[PDB]
Design a protein around this ligand. Structure first.
Ligand SMILES: *[C@@H]1O[C@H](CO)[C@@H](O[C@@H]2O[C@H](CO)[C@@H](O)[C@H](O)[C@H]2NC(C)=O)[C@H](O)[C@H]1NC(C)=O
Ligand SMILES: *[C@@H]1O[C@H](CO)[C@@H](O[C@@H]2O[C@H](CO)[C@@H](O)[C@H](O)[C@H]2NC(C)=O)[C@H](O)[C@H]1NC(C)=O
Ligand SMILES: *[C@@H]1O[C@H](CO)[C@@H](O[C@@H]2O[C@H](CO)[C@@H](O)[C@H](O)[C@H]2NC(C)=O)[C@H](O)[C@H]1NC(C)=O
Ligand SMILES: *[C@@H]1O[C@H](CO)[C@@H](O[C@@H]2O[C@H](CO)[C@@H](O)[C@H](O)[C@H]2NC(C)=O)[C@H](O)[C@H]1NC(C)=O
Lengths: 195, 199
């Protein structure tokens, strides 16, 4: 019964770690430290070392990056996941209110889900549509290397994106989940022209 | 520099852990320990604890399981991956001979890739075919919650999977990459009849 973790305001707790999309905390109760990870940020506002805890965690679908090449081009932050311990000392954790045993590890993250970057946008070639079936789905335009941790945008059923004059250089990328599409370099003149 | 790792044979290498799909080892060149993770066990035969090393670690594409409900249905073994340490102290390891920074983390992994399954021509009614665009691809029929390790079959391009009596119970799932399919209960004797007399 991991109910100790969902009511952390009542008890003593330590924020053991804050990622981009979730938080690692342990609460102390009955003399028994209970370790936990959640997406909420709610009722942990009083915990030790909670100061930087954001108001809200994004809650878009994301998975860990497995190919190290891809970090630069696809990284969209960090998040905690339940791994298993190298020593046989696995201790029980609660992940988003699911009970398990394991060890917590932080891991750099790429966007996941099913999204549709529609390359043909004829009505205005600089207003592009994005459509996904998922309840919630996330996009982000990212030159490879830029720190864009909290710059992700969540769009639910469908969306439409107009590129800023800044982003139009050849090296930016429209990441929307498992999909990824290179943004072409618009000439110095033409860019000023359109606006 | 991975150069020190990839030359396992020479140095005092200590196998520090074996997983279903890769191995964690650290070697020793002139007083500095280099932790490493590798997707094949060439070399390392004399390494300190090579006793349990597969001859081949499978190279089928797998990613880590994030939604922990799936684990029961999708398990397909465990693989080392590289993570960033919770404490600020991340150290240098080489992961499949790429130098980078972090900490070694072990996770339970599901199959990933592209393969599709509905297949063939109303024939070999107990056989279906799996086709995949990628170079290598994995499949595995797993009753949810089975002990499967190095039970995963590497196939390229195409394969045809002829079910058995056991699989045809209403409980086994055909795991192939990103897909799963449920194998339903057949009338065993209808099958039994067919296998018996037909060509
Ligand atoms: C704070 O802790 C108590 C102690 O567990 C929780 O009481 C549980 O309430 C949940 C309902 O959400 C039930 O599943 C359990 O039957 C209760 N367990 C008990 C009484 O031991 C309480 O609910 C927690 N706070 C919140 C908001 O759920
Ligand atoms: C981790 O959680 C599991 C889940 O209960 C504990 O594993 C044992 O699981 C069996 C089967 O459900 C039970 O019969 C045992 O009573 C469980 N053991 C205990 C102590 O509850 C496991 O022990 C937990 N803790 C660890 C592994 O340190
Ligand atoms: C494996 O490690 C050893 C280090 O002890 C390397 O040994 C020497 O490398 C030099 C060139 O760097 C050669 O000229 C020698 O013939 C090697 N042997 C000895 C006994 O000194 C060896 O080259 C390494 N193998 C690699 C890097 O592939
Ligand atoms: C792994 O991280 C360490 C730091 O934890 C790196 O050491 C840094 O090296 C860069 C460039 O060589 C310097 O700018 C930093 O000042 C160093 N930091 C410290 C704390 O010494 C190390 O280079 C990293 N390893 C790799 C392979 O990138």
């Amino acid at each position: 019964l991991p109910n100790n973790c969902l009511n952390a305001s009542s008890l003593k707790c330590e924020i053991k770690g804050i990622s981009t999309y979730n938080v690692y905390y342990q609460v102390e109760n009955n003399g028994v430290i209970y370790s936990c990870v959640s997406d909420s940020a709610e009722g942990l506002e009083k915990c030790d070392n909670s100061l930087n805890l954001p108001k809200r965690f994004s809650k878009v679908p994301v998975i860990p990056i497995t190919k190290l090449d891809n970090k630069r081009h696809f990284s969209v932050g960090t998040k905690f996941f339940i791994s298993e311990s190298l020593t046989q000392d696995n201790y029980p954790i609660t992940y988003n209110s699911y009970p398990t045993n394991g060890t917590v590890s932080l891991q750099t993250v790429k966007l996941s889900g099913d999204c549709k970057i529609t390359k043909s946008n004829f009505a205005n070639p600089y207003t592009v549509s994005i459509t996904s079936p998922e309840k919630i789905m996330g996009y982000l335009i990212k030159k490879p290397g830029e720190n864009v941790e909290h710059k992700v945008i969540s769009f639910s059923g469908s969306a439409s994106i107009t590129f800023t004059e800044e982003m139009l250089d050849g090296e930016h990328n429209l990441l929307c989940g498992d999909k990824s599409a290179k943004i072409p370099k618009t000439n110095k003149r033409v860019r000023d022209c359109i606006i």
